[PDB]
């Protein structure tokens, strides 16, 4: 529920890159390209790309804002739900810490928390953060997922 203390939108903008996971959801890979820019409510565009075959596909994710800096709701159409997101930890420059939260509809037990980093290649002392923040909400070492560059 943690949200990043004065948090400042603008300095997450950009270019990211998803470098870890850890979710309560067996089927939910490698890492991706994230593009991060404002969206028209006030909130955020999350723009990923991934490779299949010889194409790069791009998908967005709308945040909307959710009544505190930081703190956003996303609403899946094809799963029927509405999650809530949250930016708990970041630099700006180097890392975010992430977690989301199914809150209506089937994926309402839904639980994530993903890692994004700067550059492609995360620093090991990062990756003990991500493990450690996972470990801290409830994520068993198992379950955590460093995802590979290419
Ligand atoms: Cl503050
Ligand atoms: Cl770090």
Same mark, same amino acid.
């Not at 609403?75 to 029927?80: D, E, I, K």
């Not at 450690?132 to 909400?137: G, L, M, S, V, Y």
């Given at each position: +529920?943690? +949200?990043?203390?004065?948090? #400042? #939108?603008?300095?997450? @903008?950009?270019?990211?890159?998803?470098? &870890?996971?850890?979710?309560?959801?067996?089927?939910? @890979?490698?890492?991706?390209?994230?593009?991060?820019?404002?969206?028209?409510? &006030?909130?955020?565009?999350?723009?990923?790309?991934? @490779?299949?075959?010889?194409?790069?596909?791009?998908?967005?994710? @709308?945040? #909307?804002?959710? &009544?505190?800096?930081?703190?956003?709701?996303?609403?899946?159409?094809?799963? &029927?739900?509405? %999650?809530? +997101?949250?930016?708990?930890?970041?630099? %700006?420059?180097? %890392?975010?810490?992430? %977690?989301?939260?199914?809150?209506?509809?089937?994926?309402?037990?839904?639980?994530?928390?993903?890692?994004?980093?700067?550059?492609?290649?995360?620093?090991?002392?990062?990756?003990?953060?991500?493990?450690?923040?996972?470990?801290? #909400?409830?994520?068993?070492?198992?379950?955590?997922?460093?995802?590979?560059?290419?």
């Amino acid at each position: +529920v943690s +949200v990043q203390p004065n948090f #400042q #939108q603008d300095k997450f @903008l950009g270019r990211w890159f998803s470098a &870890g996971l850890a979710s309560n959801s067996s089927w939910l @890979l490698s890492m991706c390209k994230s593009v991060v820019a404002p969206a028209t409510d &006030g909130g955020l565009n999350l723009t990923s790309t991934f @490779l299949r075959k010889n194409q790069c596909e791009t998908r967005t994710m @709308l945040l #909307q804002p959710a &009544g505190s800096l930081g703190s956003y709701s996303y609403r899946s159409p094809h799963w &029927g739900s509405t %999650y809530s +997101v949250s930016v708990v930890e970041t630099d %700006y420059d180097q %890392y975010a810490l992430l %977690y989301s939260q199914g809150s209506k509809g089937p994926g309402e037990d839904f639980r994530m928390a993903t890692l994004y980093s700067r550059t492609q290649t995360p620093r090991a002392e990062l990756k003990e953060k991500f493990t450690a923040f996972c470990k801290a #909400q409830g994520f068993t070492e198992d379950t955590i997922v460093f995802l590979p560059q290419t």
